Each structure stands twice: as C-alpha cells, then as structure tokens.
Design a protein around this ligand. Structure first.
Ligand SMILES: [Cl-]
Ligand SMILES: [Zn+2]
Ligand SMILES: [Zn+2]
Lengths: 21, 30, 30, 21, 30, 21, 30, 21, 30, 21, 30, 21
C-alpha cells in the first residue's frame, strides 16, 4: 500500500506517482 | 523532490502537488 | 476571481481527516 | 464537483463525508 | 473521521474542521 | 487535557467536540 | 469576494505557533 | 474580529499575540 | 482582490517538498 | 517573482523546481 | 512563540510566519 | 544547521530568526 511504501519507507517521486489517477 | 518519510496529511498534500490536474487516490489499505 | 488550487489543498487535507481509514479519491478535471 | 460545491462556499464535515471512499 | 493520534498543528486544524462556526479552544494544559 | 486525550491517545470525533465552543 | 474559511485555517495554525503553551480561543461568529 | 482584522489584511506575529490566551 | 499572504504559505510548503535536501530561499519584497 | 508567477496562476512541480537552491 | 521541536514543513511555515516580509532561507545542511 | 538547532533541539524565536533574510 501507499502508507508502507512512502510513509513506512521512503519512496521516490516516480513511486509517489503510482498513486495519481 | 524530497527523499523522506511522507506520512498522514503530509503524504496527501504531496500527492496533491505531484499528481496535479489528474487527481489521485489515497487508500491506506482499504 | 477566487483560487481553486489553494482551495483544493485545503479540501484534500480535510478529506484525509474526514474519511479516515476509508480513504478517498480526489478528482478535479480530466 | 467537490471543487465546485466546496470552494464556491463552505462545506461542513458532513457534506465532505459524501466524497469519501 | 480519522482514528489516530492528532498532535500539534494537526490537532488544531482538526478542531477547526470539526467545530465549524462555533469555534473552539486549544489549551494544552494551561 | 486535550493533548493527553487526543494526541497521546486516540480520541473519537465526539471527544474532539468536547473542545468546541 | 475573498474567502474567510480558508483564511481561518491559516489563522488557527498561526495562533498555534504564536501562542505556544499559552493556548488560545478561536471564535468566528456565534 | 480576528477574521475581520487579519483576513482583510496581513497580521504580523505581533498583532497575532493579541489573540492569545 | 486575491490574497498573496495565504498563497505564500502554500508556496513555501511546496518548495519544501520539491526542493528536498537542496533547500531554497523565499523572497517576497525587500 | 514566484509570488507573481505562481499566485496569479497555478505553477506545476516542474515550474517550482526553478526556485530551488 | 512555541517552544518545541519544529520539523519538516512545520519548520518552514514557522519561518514563513516569523520572518515575514524579509523572507528566509531553508537549507537543512546544503 | 537549522534542522539540528530547531528540529533536533528546541530553539527560541530569536534563534529561528537567525534564518530570516
Ligand atoms: Cl488559502
Ligand atoms: Zn490556504
Ligand atoms: Zn505534521
């Protein structure tokens, strides 16, 4: 999920964009 | 872009900024 | 003459608190 | 849209739950 | 609504949203 | 106080409203 | 044509930092 | 009110201390 | 009739995420 | 200035990198 | 003013508020 | 740096102003 990938661990801009519409 | 733990409302503003006009979805687990 | 962008920022922070573990989808235009 | 209904005028916590997942 | 620890400025925005037009009071201990 | 009930511990919407005017 | 609601959000976050452990009361209308 | 004095125009940290508890 | 002050607040939070460890300087007027 | 270019109209993450250090 | 750890976007909004019209610089280490 | 003085440790308003332009 997004919380585990970007909050519990650091995640790049690209990875953050996997959650855009 | 930043390189750290984005959590809570902070993760959502981040999505708001990055995604832009395409919008986004915030679902902790759902 | 108001500003949607700044309002959106507020809107998504509010949905974060309101929706909780239920989450949400933010969609402006296309 | 939410932007149309909530940025033109104030939406309460209650009107916002509508837009939840 | 959310179900987690609301702290700092985050607890105040939460109060701002929930209380609405009746306003609120933020007093850590006072 | 509010910090111990809602920050140090989780507190429901109802409990959060005990701090409204 | 400005927006009070969005301004309030900013106002209460500022009072949080400014007032510190002294706290404050936020009151708009009635 | 604070909304009237600070949203019509910018208030400094100093003008804001006024509204503290 | 818009408001610069409130916009600035948004601007500096965005630069914080965008610039990351690179940082930035915020300069309005003089 | 950033205030002039980004508050009159929306700036993307890309237009904002410009103002970084 | 507050008397606690100001971190992340929170340290920047703090600078935004305190510094005012003179602006400021945010450089974690640089 | 600013992170170590105001984030890693508490720092007064005066100290916060050392970072103003
Ligand atoms: Cl705003
Ligand atoms: Zn705003
Ligand atoms: Zn935070």
């Amino acid at each position: 999920g997004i919380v585990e990938q970007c909050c519990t661990s650091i995640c790049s801009l690209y990875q953050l964009e996997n959650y855009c519409n | 872009f930043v390189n750290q733990h984005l959590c809570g409302s902070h993760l959502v503003e981040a999505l708001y900024l990055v995604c832009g006009x395409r919008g986004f979805f915030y679902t902790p687990k759902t």
